[PDB]
């Protein structure tokens, strides 16, 4: 008894959002996946509304304890 809304601007963004959430760790402060190259544990959150630096292993902020104990893997 009601006409449903129609759109096509879906599935491509969804499948990209799913693939990124499984291939990259979510930033602790903004739940946004952040890319990691090489083997340094020094992660810088790629979201402008964040800037948060974090240890890829520890899920907490970047600190001297993380620089001595595992700067890289």
């Amino acid at each position: 008894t009601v006409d449903p809304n129609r759109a096509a601007e879906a599935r491509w963004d969804e499948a990209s959002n799913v693939t990124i959430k499984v291939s990259t760790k979510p930033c602790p402060k903004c739940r946004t996946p952040t890319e990691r190259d090489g083997g340094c544990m020094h992660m810088v959150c790629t979201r402008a509304g964040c800037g948060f630096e974090w240890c890829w292993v520890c899920q907490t902020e970047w600190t001297r304890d993380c620089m001595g104990a595992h700067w890289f893997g």
Partner: protein, 75 residues
């Protein structure tokens, strides 16, 4: 054609490109206006990655298509 490049920030950008544009030229056109280095651009199109040596036609990318821009870190 206009495409949309959706960053991991939430800033989505407009970009004018041809079906014949190489993925390298798409990244250079992102660097021009956004300042973002091409070697730090991981383009994703529906799970698939865009290789720099391919074109927009090689991925069947049409007008109004929305690409994911993942920003690669150096650590």
């Amino acid at each position: 054609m206009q495409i949309f490049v959706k960053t991991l920030t939430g800033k989505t950008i407009t970009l004018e490109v041809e079906p014949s544009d190489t993925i390298e030229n798409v990244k250079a056109k992102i660097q021009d206006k956004e300042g973002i280095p091409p070697d730090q651009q991981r383009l994703i199109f529906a799970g698939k990655q865009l290789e720099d040596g391919r074109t927009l036609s090689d991925y069947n990318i049409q007008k109004e298509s929305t690409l994911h821009l993942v920003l690669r870190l150096r650590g």
